[PDB]
Design an enzyme around this catalytic site. Structure first.
Site, short mmCIF file in Angstrom:
data_model
loop_
_atom_site.label_atom_id
_atom_site.label_comp_id
_atom_site.label_asym_id
_atom_site.label_seq_id
_atom_site.Cartn_x
_atom_site.Cartn_y
_atom_site.Cartn_z
N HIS A 188 -40.14 18.42 -19.45
CA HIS A 188 -40.86 17.80 -20.76
C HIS A 188 -41.16 18.79 -21.50
O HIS A 188 -41.58 18.67 -22.91
CB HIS A 188 -41.93 16.79 -20.48
CG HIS A 188 -42.58 16.12 -21.55
ND1 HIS A 188 -41.76 15.18 -22.63
CD2 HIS A 188 -43.82 16.00 -22.15
CE1 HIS A 188 -42.48 14.80 -23.55
NE2 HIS A 188 -43.72 15.41 -23.11
N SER A 223 -43.41 16.08 -28.53
CA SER A 223 -44.30 15.07 -27.60
C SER A 223 -44.90 14.16 -28.92
O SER A 223 -44.20 13.74 -30.12
CB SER A 223 -45.22 15.59 -26.97
OG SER A 223 -46.49 15.02 -26.74
N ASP A 270 -36.92 14.35 -17.89
CA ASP A 270 -38.10 14.37 -18.64
C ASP A 270 -38.87 13.16 -17.94
O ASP A 270 -38.53 12.03 -18.20
CB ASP A 270 -37.75 14.27 -20.19
CG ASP A 270 -39.09 14.33 -20.84
OD1 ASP A 270 -40.22 14.04 -20.52
OD2 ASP A 270 -39.12 14.98 -22.06
#
Length: 264
Positions: free
Chosen positions: A244, A94, A215
């Protein structure tokens, strides 16, 4: 040394090749707990908490300083320098994928390899680029998060985890609930305002782009965008994992793919 303590720096494992595991938005280093056993035999594993993690003293989150990703890069480089790490493989989920990209541009010699998980250089759509989000839609959500943090976490966590893995939904919710809501909102704005597209070409280290199915925060086209625009040697790994947060929902399978990538 006070930085090492403040951000819960942990060094574990029997190996001597350095592997940095850098968590992303809404978790702390405990997100790597189920990955970690697969690397202790043959790596020296370095873990730390981003300053915004719920496990960090919120006193350390200086709104005057942490206005972009650059101060987060400062923390990462300070830690690697303080540990005497001159070269490592770095895994970033991320936002930590983008922090590692910026770190590598500043210190090209420091990273042998970047492994990017759930990475996007840009969330907002424009005429030529699909990030997955419309500018117009995001303010009503920021308002919702400010109004009712618990309702926001309860709607967000299942969409983030994506796959029907209820234990991972509960675990991601737990670490979101540890974060101070004003820090969560501020960091959320920081990541939606980010645009790393300009700098991808400046990367020279090899990048492994780990992309899950469905995602909610990273369209498939974004992984292809990173493959085309990161300046070094790029490999896309299309994981047989939905959602995710594959380190939370599918750790055994993610650990095998990481091992493969680190061997390449």
């Amino acid at each position: 040394q006070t930085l090492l303590d403040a951000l819960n720096v942990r060094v574990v494992g029997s190996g001597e090749r350095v592997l940095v595991l850098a968590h992303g938005f809404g978790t702390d280093q405990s997100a790597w707990n189920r990955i970690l056993p697969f690397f202790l035999r043959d790596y020296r594993v370095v873990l730390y908490d981003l300053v915004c993690a719920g496990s960090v003293n919120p006193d350390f989150f200086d709104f005057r300083r942490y206005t972009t990703l650059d101060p987060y890069v400062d923390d990462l480089l300070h830690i690697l320098d303080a540990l005497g790490i001159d070269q490592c493989a770095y895994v970033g989920h991320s936002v930590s994928a983008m922090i590692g990209i910026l770190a590598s541009i500043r210190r090209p010699e420091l990273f042998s390899k970047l492994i990017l998980i759930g990475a996007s250089p840009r969330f907002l759509n424009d005429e030529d680029y699909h990030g997955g989000f419309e500018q117009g839609e995001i303010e009503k959500v920021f308002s919702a998060m400010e109004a009712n943090y618990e309702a926001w976490v309860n709607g967000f966590a299942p969409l983030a985890v994506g796959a029907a893995v209820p234990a991972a939904v509960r675990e991601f919710s737990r670490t979101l609930f540890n974060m101070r809501p004003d820090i969560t909102l501020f960091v959320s704005r920081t990541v939606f305002n980010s645009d790393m597209r300009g700098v991808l070409g400046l990367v020279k280290v090899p990048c492994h782009i780990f992309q899950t199915a469905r995602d909610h925060s990273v369209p498939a086209s974004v992984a292809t965008y990173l493959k085309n625009h990161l300046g070094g040697k790029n490999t896309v790994h299309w994981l047989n994992i939905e959602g995710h947060l594959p380190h939370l929902s599918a750790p055994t399978l993610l650990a095998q793919e990481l091992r493969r990538a680190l061997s390449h």
